[PDB]
Design a protein around this ligand. Structure first.
Ligand SMILES: Cc1c(Oc2ccccc2OCCn2ccc(=O)[nH]c2=O)cc(N(C)C(=O)CCl)c2ccc(C#N)cc12
Lengths: 400, 547
């Protein structure tokens, strides 16, 4: 009911990002949505004196046939002044966590007068026939980092009774999402979630306990071919960058001579001992692996085939903070890009739960393909940063 | 007097921290001064400008050619940024056929859009007096000056706001605004069409804007931005390839400009060689000889550009189809159409700069380009006809290390067909000879050696002059491919060679890589295994090639 002064970082102008082309159905959807929001005062039309722009597109969330408006506030977010809560380190330790969309609550708080012109966006026209419908926000926009910061006080006032009632429930907020962690039963968790949503009304099942870090495992065979031993020495040599005491000389000793790749080689006793020592070494955690809130999080994804994907979250090379394998199949059996996009969304969600921020992705895909198709399968309210790797990494099978 | 509705002014500011322009007035001849006094007197009588006192410290130079011409380049440098009037120009293939299309001249409205009061003082200009014996006449603009930075954007915005209710209450027509011209199309009867045109003239007159009752000068075929727009079709303005005995650099840039521009409707245009002659020149007047490939390419262009070809307009009720053909040397051509033999438009795609490539990657890139273009022009992705078998694409994307995807498409049998030229095995090959390869070079003398030893006792080491480590590693693999049977296992330590071959190229800049590809095509089964170097892995003999 009272606007809080918001400004930009010193020396930075507002965002001026090109609106990318949209299909006709998305344009029409945005026309209906923005017409309705204009009738509600949430947005207002602007004139040519506003040079700032932020991209916009339309999506369809899970279990819904209504379109939704997505604004790519990444540039404005990095150009918006830093607002100033320690991250709940116990949210990742909880048994279950549910994600709720509280973005509607932001639209009840007006936006600072002078700052509105930086939220400008454009509904584009087909074939550049018309100049495009230009809008700016009058309330807190969904996707902007200042919205949860400004609404944090009111959110504390709304969640104060529920927090006081259940001290065992962890509550976290990131952008337009509310993460609610507990240790109850799935039915009790769903009834409790309905309790919290009806509590918020009058004013996504996720289980981190079933997620752990993945160790480097070595094969267990009764007979090894030359090729098997070569791959094993390769994987152990790669793992020696992560683990100090990895030793491969006794296994490389067996590869002496020019033998056929399919020839079975029996292991010597020294080779068995070396392999067992390497197993014991790989069973231990990595030495000196810590998180630095001042550094970026980097996430790498490898396509393993048959709907299987691997990923690693780290900050320094060979110091993995998280590793995982997303093999879920959900209507994307014939589309690599949809699988990759869902994987990026899940990894970003896990990173939000663990560290409270999104990582920078390294995507195994050509820039043009991804930039062409990723909005088609995006269902989250946030967007991370990403870059593209054009050279096949050798370590792929070493994560398989 | 009928009350004229006021046009809302757009608030305008200068760039932050800057000040209005202050430029010395140009000295003018007596006749030019008299002409500018007459013109500015008439404009003041009409209300476009107003006299100002000496308090205004700003000034912008004025000229006459009469016709008054104010040079606002400084004020433009000091004026704020505005939202772009147009992000891009439309494409004729996106237009929808209309029974009637009328052109209205709203030029007189340009000078009828008011300027923000607080900004008018920055448009001040001075007419020098005769013999400079009196203070020059001081004027300022009250409306959008032509040549000012924000005039087109504010004009188009104001006109759009004026036309919004008329277009809303008449959905059965289409109105388009371009510069000081409106274009109104409809499928109604010609009588109803002229009626609604009169209604538009009245609605514009309710803001005091006058559309001429004179029959407009624009009439089919409409010539616009190098385009010919007809009632039922569109094309490019005539493209004439000149007959030159010798071609300079600007002749080749003009020829590649005409061919690039003509390629959007003429199918099969190629610009590879002619643009290749312009590689790394940076000399406009340099005369470059013509290669034979450029001569054959230019002859094919003259054969394609012989007779005129037209494109149709977009019919939203029919499906959108895009068909692709490979032309070789990284060249691709495509037609976008709805009915067979009647193209909406055409185009080409050239492969990107790269050391290694294959046909499937280029076809994928071209599909992405056509998809973006089609979403721009028509707002939807077309269905594709591609020269590649379904099984070929399935094998490729299932086995490719990168994620990839093309939208709905069907196979069309139009050679040359995009195919996979070789496929590496996933597991070692039983019964096949195993070639342990290696290569090495001296960084100073550039002397090296490349070779292999096999499980059957076959060996070879070749010495090489003027080579590198990477070159000797590739050369080692090549030697193993040369001397082996149809099925072969190859063991290397070269992360570089594996990085190249796992990218699956079918063509390369390096002749050595191309030779390796040619050897791979001849093979039946090839398994390529990697091992770490200098780890004592026997067979992998680093000392054999470092002698
Ligand atoms: C006649 C004209 C434009 O046409 C239309 C105008 C209004 C509705 C539909 C139209 O097009 C349908 C296809 N069509 C075209 C010609 C014809 O006779 N019959 C026919 O059905 C569109 C333009 N472009 C490209 C625009 O961006 C609109 Cl400012 C023009 C641009 C310049 C000039 C000039 N001189 C003229 C333009």
């Amino acid at each position: 009911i009272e606007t809080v002064p918001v400004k930009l970082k010193p020396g930075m102008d507002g965002p001026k990002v090109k609106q990318w082309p949209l299909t006709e159905e998305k344009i029409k959807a945005l026309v209906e949505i923005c017409t309705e929001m204009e009738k509600e005062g949430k947005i207002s039309k602007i004139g040519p004196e506003n040079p700032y722009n932020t991209p916009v597109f339309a999506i369809k969330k899970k279990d819904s046939t209504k379109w939704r408006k997505l604004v790519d506030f990444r540039e404005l977010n990095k150009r918006t002044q830093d607002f100033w809560i320690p991250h709940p380190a116990g949210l990742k330790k909880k048994k279950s966590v549910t994600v709720l969309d509280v973005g509607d609550a932001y639209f009840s708080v007006p936006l600072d007068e002078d700052f509105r012109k930086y939220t400008a966006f454009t509904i584009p026209s087909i074939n550049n026939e018309t100049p495009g419908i230009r809008y700016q926000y009058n309330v807190l926009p969904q996707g902007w980092k200042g919205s949860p910061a400004i609404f944090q006080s009111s959110m504390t006032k709304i969640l104060e009774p529920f927090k006081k009632q259940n001290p065992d429930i962890v509550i976290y907020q990131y952008m337009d999402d509310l993460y609610v962690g507990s240790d109850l039963e799935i039915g009790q968790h769903r009834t409790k979630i309905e309790e919290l949503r009806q509590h918020l009304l009058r004013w996504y099942e996720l289980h981190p306990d079933k997620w752990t870090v993945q160790p480097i495992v070595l094969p267990e065979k009764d007979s090894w071919t030359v090729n098997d031993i070569q791959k094993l020495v390769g994987k152990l040599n790669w793992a020696s960058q992560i683990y100090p005491g990895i030793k491969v000389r006794q296994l490389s000793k067996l590869l002496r001579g020019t033998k056929a790749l399919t020839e079975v080689i029996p292991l010597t006793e020294e080779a068995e001992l070396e392999l067992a020592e390497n197993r014991e070494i790989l069973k231990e955690p990595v030495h000196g692996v810590y998180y630095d809130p001042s550094k970026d999080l980097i996430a790498e994804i490898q396509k393993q085939g048959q709907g299987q994907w691997t990923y690693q979250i780290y900050q320094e090379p060979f110091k993995n903070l998280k590793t995982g394998k997303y093999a879920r199949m959900r209507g994307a059996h014939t589309n690599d890009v949809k699988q990759l996009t869902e994987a990026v969304q899940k990894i970003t969600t896990e990173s939000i739960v663990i560290w409270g921020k999104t990582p920078k992705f390294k995507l195994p895909i050509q820039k043009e393909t991804w930039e062409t198709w990723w909005t088609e399968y995006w269902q989250a309210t946030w967007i991370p940063e990403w870059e593209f790797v054009n050279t096949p990494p050798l370590v792929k099978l070493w994560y398989q | 007097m009928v009350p004229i509705s006021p046009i809302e002014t757009v608030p305008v500011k200068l760039k932050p921290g800057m000040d209005g322009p202050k430029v010395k007035q140009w000295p003018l001849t007596e006749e030019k001064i008299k002409a500018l006094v007459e013109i500015c007197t008439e404009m003041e009588k009409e209300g476009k400008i107003s006299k100002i006192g000496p308090e205004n410290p700003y000034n912008t130079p004025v000229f006459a050619i009469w016709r008054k011409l104010v040079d606002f380049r400084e004020l433009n440098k000091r004026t704020q940024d505005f939202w772009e009037v147009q992000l891009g120009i439309p494409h004729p293939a996106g237009l929808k056929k209309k029974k009637s299309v009328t052109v209205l001249d709203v030029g007189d409205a340009y000078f009828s859009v008011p300027l923000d009061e607080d900004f008018r003082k920055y448009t001040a200009f001075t007419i020098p007096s005769i013999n400079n014996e009196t203070p020059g006449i001081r004027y300022q603009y009250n409306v959008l000056p032509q040549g000012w930075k924000g005039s087109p954007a504010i004009f188009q915005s104001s006109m759009t706001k004026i036309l919004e209710p008329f277009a809303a209450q008449n959905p059965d027509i289409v109105i388009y605004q371009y510069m000081d011209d409106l274009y109104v199309g409809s499928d109604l009867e010609i009588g109803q069409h002229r009626t609604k045109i009169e209604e538009l003239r009245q609605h514009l007159l309710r803001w005091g804007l006058t559309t001429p009752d004179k029959k407009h000068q624009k009439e089919p075929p409409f010539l616009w931005m190098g385009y010919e727009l007809h009632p039922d079709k569109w094309t490019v303005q005539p493209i004439v390839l000149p007959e030159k005995d010798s071609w300079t650099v600007n002749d080749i840039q003009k020829l590649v400009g005409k061919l690039n521009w003509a390629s959007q409707i003429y199918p099969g245009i190629k610009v590879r060689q002619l643009s290749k002659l312009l590689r790394g020149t940076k000399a406009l007047t340099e005369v470059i000889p013509l290669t034979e490939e450029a001569e054959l390419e230019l002859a094919e262009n003259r054969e394609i550009l012989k007779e005129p070809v037209h494109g149709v307009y977009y019919d939203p009720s029919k499906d959108l189809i895009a068909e692709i053909q490979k032309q070789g040397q990284g060249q691709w051509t495509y037609q976008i159409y709805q009915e067979p033999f009647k193209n909406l438009k055409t185009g080409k795609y050239a492969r990107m700069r790269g050391a290694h490539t294959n046909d499937v990657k280029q076809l994928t890139e071209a599909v992405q380009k056509i998809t973006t273009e089609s979403i721009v022009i028509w707002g939807k992705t077309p269905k594709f006809k591609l020269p590649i078998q379904k099984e070929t694409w399935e094998t490729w994307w299932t086995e490719y290390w990168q994620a990839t995807w093309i939208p709905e498409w069907e196979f069309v049998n139009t050679p040359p067909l995009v195919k996979l030229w070789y496929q590496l095995e996933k597991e070692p090959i039983v019964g096949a000879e195993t070639f342990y390869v290696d290569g090495a070079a001296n960084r100073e003398t550039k002397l090296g050696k490349a070779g292999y030893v096999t499980n059957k006792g076959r060996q070879k080491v070749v010495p090489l002059t003027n080579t590198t480590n990477q070159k000797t590693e590739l050369q080692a693999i090549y030697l193993a491919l040369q001397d082996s049977g149809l099925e072969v296992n190859i063991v290397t330590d070269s992360q570089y060679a594996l990085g190249i071959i796992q990218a699956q190229p079918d063509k390369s800049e390096s002749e050595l890589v191309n030779q390796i590809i040619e050897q791979l095509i001849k093979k039946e089964k090839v398994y390529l295994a990697w091992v770490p170097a200098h780890k004592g892995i026997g067979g992998n003999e680093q000392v054999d090639k470092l002698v």
